[PDB]
C-alpha cells in the first residue's frame, strides 16, 4: 500500500533540496517571461 498524498507532498517539501528547486523555478519564471516578451512583439 502506497503512502497517502498529503504526507507525500509534505515529505517532498521536507527532505528535498532548496537551492536546486529555487534555481529551477527562477529559471522557469525567466523562460516564461521571455515567452511573454516574444509574444508581445
Amino acid at each position: 500500500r502506497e503512502l497517502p498524498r498529503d504526507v507525500k507532498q509534505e515529505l517532498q517539501s521536507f527532505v528535498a533540496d532548496a537551492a536546486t528547486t529555487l534555481e529551477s523555478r527562477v529559471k522557469y519564471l525567466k523562460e516564461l517571461d521571455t515567452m511573454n516578451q516574444r509574444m508581445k512583439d
Binding site: 507532498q9 509534505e10 517539501s13 521536507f14 532548496a18 528547486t21 529555487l22 523555478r25 527562477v26 519564471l29 525567466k30 517571461d33
Partner: peptide, 24 residues
C-alpha cells in the same frame, strides 16, 4: 508547511529582486 510556503513564494521574490530584466 513553512518550507512549502517558502518554496512557493521565495522563487517569485528572488525573481523580482535579482533576475528580473529591464522593462522598455
Amino acid at each position: 508547511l513553512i518550507r512549502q510556503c517558502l518554496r512557493d513564494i521565495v522563487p517569485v521574490i528572488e525573481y523580482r529582486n535579482r533576475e528580473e530584466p529591464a522593462r522598455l
